Symmetry: D2
Subunit: 337 residues, 4 copies
């Protein structure tokens, strides 16, 4: 099982770091036109959130040598031009943020990639898989280009699945309090695209409302919840770790204690490694580098009555997501190509 990364950004670099921990997938090629091999080596070795790379990075010459293993480096604007097949890359992690359609992401298959995982929710009807929710619905004969959804969908959908299966979600509304991202700016200025005028405001001293499609995305991943969730985000100045705040009306009565046991039962059985739980007095920094998709915080939750609850789940939007994308690439490899 071999992996190519297009776009060596926050997700592309932490996907690389996650594979270097992992014995059943290897990164064999990277493409990023806005950094040479030496700048790629620097942004890999040093991270302002995730700390110094655990291992060795050197430049061998238009290639990286990461823990002693050769990683071919490319600088191609066009996906059709990256020689993925020559490099021996079977799956491409597409993490540029700018090839989020089947039309655009399928051009990677001309380079000789077998499968493409988009690291984003798609602009079209590319199927989204979330690990431990609907990843086993994946059909290798039907799709070559798939999406791993967003950080937030990977947080919310495991929690929503547990809740819906055990109690039933009638109606739900999510807020995500979300750490800041590359789309935001250090000082007030024109947003790229003049599209989210608010995203362009000084990131470090503002609470910034954002639209997110994450909650409607849970309706694709869990069709039972189609039209039962919507949601909004609030961007805050912290550098990493985000929190989903899911308000739902339940079809059956459930105490927070009953919900906590339902979560604990799934975390210790079918969603081992994806869903986690805590009863500790935790704060966002406590999950930097957490590999779980979703950590249910028992003591932060509040119920109005047995039927109407607000549930709090943490997620490392950088590190948790990247582990899931590597999980899905391992899973997709096991199903053939």
């Amino acid at each position: 099982g071999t992996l190519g990364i297009n776009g060596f950004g926050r997700i592309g670099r932490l996907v690389l770091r996650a594979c270097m921990e992992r014995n059943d997938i290897t990164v064999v090629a990277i493409n990023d036109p806005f950094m040479d091999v030496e700048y790629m080596a620097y942004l890999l070795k040093y991270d302002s959130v995730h700390g110094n790379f655990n291992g060795t990075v050197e430049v061998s010459g238009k290639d990286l040598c990461i823990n002693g293993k050769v990683v071919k480096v490319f600088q191609a604007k066009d996906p059709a031009e990256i020689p993925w097949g020559a490099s021996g890359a079977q799956i491409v992690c597409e993490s540029t943020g700018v090839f989020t359609t089947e039309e655009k992401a399928s051009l990677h298959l001309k380079g000789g990639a077998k499968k493409v995982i988009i690291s984003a929710p798609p602009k079209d009807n590319v199927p989204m898989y979330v690990m431990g929710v609907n990843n086993t619905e994946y059909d290798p004969s039907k799709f070559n280009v798939i999406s791993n959804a967003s950080c937030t969908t990977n947080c919310l959908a495991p929690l929503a699945k547990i809740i819906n299966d055990k109690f039933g979600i009638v109606e739900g509304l999510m807020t995500t309090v979300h750490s800041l991202t590359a789309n935001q700016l250090t000082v007030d200025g024109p947003s790229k695209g003049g599209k989210d005028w608010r995203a362009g405001r000084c990131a470090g001293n503002n609470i910034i409302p954002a639209s997110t499609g994450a909650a409607k995305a849970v309706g694709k991943v869990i069709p039972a919840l189609n039209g039962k969730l919507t949601g909004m985000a609030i961007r805050v100045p912290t550098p990493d770790v985000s929190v989903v705040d899911l308000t739902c009306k339940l079809a059956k009565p459930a105490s927070i204690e009953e919900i906590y046991q339902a979560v604990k039962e799934a975390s210790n059985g079918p969603m081992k490694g994806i869903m986690g739980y805590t009863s500790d007095d935790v704060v966002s920094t406590d999950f930097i580098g957490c590999k779980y998709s979703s950590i249910f915080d028992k003591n932060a939750c509040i119920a109005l009555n047995d039927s109407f609850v607000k549930l709090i789940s943490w997620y490392d939007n950088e590190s948790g997501y990247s582990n899931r994308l590597v999980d899905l690439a391992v899973y997709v490899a096991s199903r053939g190509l």
Copy 2:
């Protein structure tokens, strides 16, 4: 109408700044044992959020001279010892955070104060008034010690009143994304009281869940909503301005447009000066120094269906609250003593 301030902290100092804008109430005495007159002058003249004091501050000698008017200064630990009557202070703004019972705050009446406004939700059954919600229920013959509730209750209760009167709230759950406060710490350490273990975590790099009684407080201020709201807070690193995120099931169908008109109608009529609205792409810094209790953000709100909505309202937790406390002191003066 004359005002004494006990506790020259964030609320005590901005109450002073609000009165200096105001022609129908004057601050005549301050008490704070943890700052001398010269340090009081400094913390008044300079503010990291609210900017340089608009006017003159000098030390005349154990007294302040603020815009040319003498303000007597005291350094008394015990409220029974502050000579409020001698200084000519009729109302005491009690903003220490440590005399939030009738038992403790009534000791100010021994000093010759006529009325006490607690600048906090009380630990006992002191009545809470919120301006433009239930302030006209105040009976001067029945209470000498009253509370102005919290910043958050002053944000949520005007919005909840508008919504409940027009559509009816069945059930509601609030999240407040709240700017950081004096209870928090710059670095991880023992909380004062070892009570909110999470509040003691490094304030500047963490998202910190908090308990808040603000939403249950709306059930005292609006008895129709007793038991219909609860709520939680999330402390974030921004220095000022907070946002209430009210998820409610409504008894009547309402679009966000219908809710926006209901808010606009109340902001331009009975809640002039308390409730505001915006359709601009606003972010938290845009309300620093806003005197409104609550600014409804039309474009941040989201409805799941005609009956289940999430509403977003901003509030300057420092400046908006302080104006309301000065409003209530003016109102309480007009009712006698």
Copy 3:
């Protein structure tokens, strides 16, 4: 005296805000291709540091109406294409950051501008004027394109002039602790140009060393100090206000008290409005919106001996600079064209 702004960024917008306070210069046209008239109106009305615009902004139709006065708006990538003469703009404030040569900035004169002020230190030998230092050396018959230097050069050169004239600078080394800027990124990523690899690291949680040419620039503005100063910057997460820390060996003995009087004498005479001083326990937020170039902080300075001193001067890098650029445009207008 009329002013056109090319580049409606942090400096372009605060130059506009400074002129709206000012009765002897008017902004008559703006050019920015990366924002339409409606987005320009938004970024003008709302500021995360400088607060809500003091006055009215509306869109009249591909034009702004700012405090009731028409400001023509353009969206041209090429300076040769902006019709400055048609709009009646005599001086162009060139604040894009990308036309910092005479070759590139002189193309504005094809549009019918008479004079160009670059809002940056130049990449070539365009002359730099600093107000109250060497602005009277300006020869209108010799130069049409001039530079206003940097924020830091405007802080350091008034202080260096006072010190050098009174005591004599033998050798000096500057550090500027500098608030974050549009060149920085919210999260770790490729710098624009792959040039300052460090500038591309997460701005909000890092102390970031930077190169600055500000101190060598003081050697152009004050030729007596050519080769006597160099300097470096440290970027820190605060949103605005910077501090120059000038370590100098002096040719004559001077106590900090003697230096404080020298500064006070110049602030109250020849550098009225440019150089300021404080003996208060000030912190960076206390100078947000300060119009001075340089505020000498007496109590932060330290001398090793009568000859070797470290001097601390604050500056609002956004607001102070923008006032100086408007000052220089008023001055340049008074000298002819």
Copy 4:
């Protein structure tokens, strides 16, 4: 070699974490009256800078069990009352910040401690040792109570020793750009002691000048430099890692390259483990958890001429200092008692 910790704050807790990495010293007792055993366990297991404790923490019952080893816990205000001898603690790390005299810190010897290390510069003439500078001057027959100096003195004195021995320091002035500390406040308020009025200003949005005695302290640790250094600090909002900026006139000519080799030679020989160096484009976050006292940043330094240089050295003020205090406790144990 056994260690007791008085004061389980940032330094007390990271001293514990450093010993748990270390095979030649064991923490056997902790005293902190402002946290019970359960709150001590929480503040040990979770850290907003240093991440989750690497190992196990449980409460056995008024005792901790840390990686399976019993650590006795006390809650005594008075040092004379802590039974250090009963617990088997030979050295006491005194890290409260409030027993920084021989008079006060010697009361720990009544509890049956043999030696006391103050984790601070002393208010009196307690001797200061810095590891790899003057620690071998320590005489166990002459002193039972010693100081490990400050974080900054441990950064500056190794660098100053290398520079002075090789080139000679004529005169030097230090600035430290310093991460925020427990003395600072989240919002503007009275400083504890009304002493550093500036330290009491909102920590997260301000650049705050501070006095530091660190540079004069280098004159005790290196008597050759008595009266040759002074220095000041600037507190900035970052949560950890600080940078010393040493401007010195040298007695011999030295290029930054010659200084870099002098540092490299000492880092790889006599100051192995204390002094480090980097030529990478590093930023403060890159040294979180660095165990070095001082990391010389070649590419951030600047020389005016061969004789007058500004040198930049990083230090983790929390983690680097704590390792040095554990180093000194190991060293002091090896010399007898």
